[model samples]
Target: PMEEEEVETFAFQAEIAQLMSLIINTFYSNKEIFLRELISNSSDALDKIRYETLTDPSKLDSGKELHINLIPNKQDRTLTIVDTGIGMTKADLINNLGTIAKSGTKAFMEALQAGADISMIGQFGVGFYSAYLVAEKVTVITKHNDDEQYAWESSAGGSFTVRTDTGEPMGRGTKVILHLKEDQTEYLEERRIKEIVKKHSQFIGYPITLFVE
Candidate 1:
């Protein structure tokens, strides 16, 4: 017998709603910065898994190579970023993505209202919001060593959802899919993506492979 799938939805915290609005509207001047921010995030996940393997070799997936893959599908109007790294648990998804800056939401908002330059909020963990600049919908499928695979999805419409993924099991990593906006089709071009990667993430710690059809 098949098991019932568990699906749950949660509203984005008040501060996260504000942060996403800031990122989609005024935080970034260049839309291409979305790729740079996402690539950097993948690097961080890769680094985390590498460090974990040092203490517990079991966490390492020796069969799978550690790298990031960028796949642009014009037919589907989607851009996917796949990373063979430490992925997130269900709680990690809710806390890291649904919350703003861990526990600094209050302080961050206070500083914002105090007329501080937005850039002053550096390292406040807003990079993920850049995905909203070009995507109407974002879906993340992640598998951590300690947890089962789960898919987290959102449209930056004030709420998000998480559910157990019944699709093909990932060995251990995260796959981020961005359903591109109509006007943002330029991101599906190989040349444009390569140019952005070269401009911002050229020296990224892990090799980033862009798959071309």
Candidate 2:
């Protein structure tokens, strides 16, 4: 009576590939922006869940505080961002991370090609790709109120895979784990992460805590 797990792989939309390449290789002199982009995304998720819980109280877990946690592991050279927010379902992961899906991916690509000074691109829907700037592999573990938990992983190599996850259930929300590149190990330092958070996302609506070992 054993059940098998299924993993599905999806290719990045053409715009996503281009965006990733640009962010990873050519664009962004300020790599610290990655943390800001991720934190902003967490804020957005928190807002969504808060709004939903107002009408559908079942969507929220009692006593579950809405906040963001930044965990940096020097031993493993990894940085993890956890948020108690509106988590993504399997379809949401594919549409949000893989496909264009009205994220202004086309506009982003066009702006970059035009040699425009797009300092505000991080606020655009393509900000998630900034993770590739520092991570060799990015893993997203998410639990949506209405769906089973899942893990989505990608190396930004044109394709990503998603499958059901059986680890500790999040109850609800998302966790993004970044396997840092050798040169990007600076992100594993608590001080560095703190500075980035303080500088960029200090005013974010949700509380952000950094876990230090």
Candidate 3:
């Protein structure tokens, strides 16, 4: 358990960084669709685990149920979605949240240079960054089977921070905390989340639960 520095914070600018602009505000026309994308990402992670468990049963030995949980705290004004799935490594956290990291941006820039179907870029962002549509801040705590637990946090101001998680073990999953905006109040309601799930994720191949009162 030895390493160099742990916490890292990074940011991106819109006009200067195209990929950052993409990650921060790219393809999504509807911000509400972010819930669907997050669920889809969790489902994909679980699918990876399911595929792995076929050969390595130890992957499932953590006793964590293969399900998704939506926990909303009104007092804190946060909506959290947790999934027991194949989580991420620190490198993944950095690469993904970093936005304008080398590889993805270059190719996208080439496409832009080639004038490939480019359209309006009026602050409409990416599927992941859609949280900013409704959240002032977003916190992600994830535990991967191959890596230590870690936390990735970001805000609408355009920067994100990553660090090793010091909290209780997350068992083997990812937790997304959306520190929502007041206008996004409807997201905290079970009925609303249920409707969103049913509309977008009824066939996601895993159980998705919203906390009951």
Candidate 4:
């Protein structure tokens, strides 16, 4: 039997919420770690679809580019990192990020606190928030096969919004744009992005791309 609110209630399991907040507010030791986590996630995402495609060829078209795009605007001091990989279902957006009343995140954190290993991937923008180390605005544009393309934007003010991409929806993928602060100008440099990629993702499964001006 299913409760009318079952779909809504499934987001977390009580213990998870506490753990989620603990890890988000703590666990992380450094700020520049956002790049490594994002690139590692991109690698994992590609590997997943590749494995699935081996069994189902149709999975191949789900993401066309299948790589990362780093866009740094010096004038605006914004850096956008985009990837075409396993996109999320609309429900996933809420279930993962909008952990309204559940405790799954809390439990996950408990596991970490108890010495269980965790993949830093799909922390669903938790680690990405570390971009606040240097950014004023963070935008994530995502498109999935099961749902329409949507963009998630936030200004680090503890509030965010989800809206239609409003322009041409990207293919199956997500783009993360980080609007940097004046003091964060180093991130807007080509050499900085390149060095970071080569160090952390030289062996990444896909071709990493950068939009240079």
Q: Where does model 4 exceed 4 Å of error?
A: 1-30, 59-62, 100-126
Q: Summarize candidate 3's per-residue lDDT along 1-213 as a digit string, tens digits.
A: 645547887765443245444445544344566687778778888888888896988555452688888898888888998998888888888766555444334555456456543322222233365466577778999887778889998665556788988777878888999988777888888888888888867788888888855
Q: After the best TM-score superposition of candidate 3, give how far the Cα of residue 171 lies from its true spot, in angstroms.
A: 0.9
Writing each residue's lDDT as its tens digit, candidate 4 over 119-209 gives 4423633444345556667777777766877666655334456665557667887777787766668888889888877775678778888
lDDT of 1 by residue, 1-213 (tens): 787779998888887887767655554446787888888888999999888887998556522788999999999999999999899999999888885344655676677666654443435556677788789899999998888899999987688999999888876999999999898999999999999999978899888999998
Candidate 3 vs. true structure, TM-score:
0.76
Model 3 C-alpha lDDT versus the unseen true structure: 0.71
- Model 2 Cα RMSD, Å? 2.2
Candidate 3 stretches with Cα past 4 Å from truth are: 1-5, 12-29, 58-63, 100-126
* Global CA lDDT computed for model 4: 0.63
Query: Ten residues in a row with the worst lDDT in model 1?
Result: 116-125
CA lDDT, candidate 4, residue 33: 58
What are the clashing pairs of model 3?
25-124, 25-125, 26-125, 26-126
Each prediction's RMSD to truth: 3.0, 2.2, 5.6, 7.5
Model 4, position 160, has a per-residue lDDT of 54
Please state the error at residue 126 of candidate 3 in Å: 4.3
Superposed by TM-score, candidate 3 places the C-alpha of residue 39 at a distance from the truth, in angstroms, of 0.6
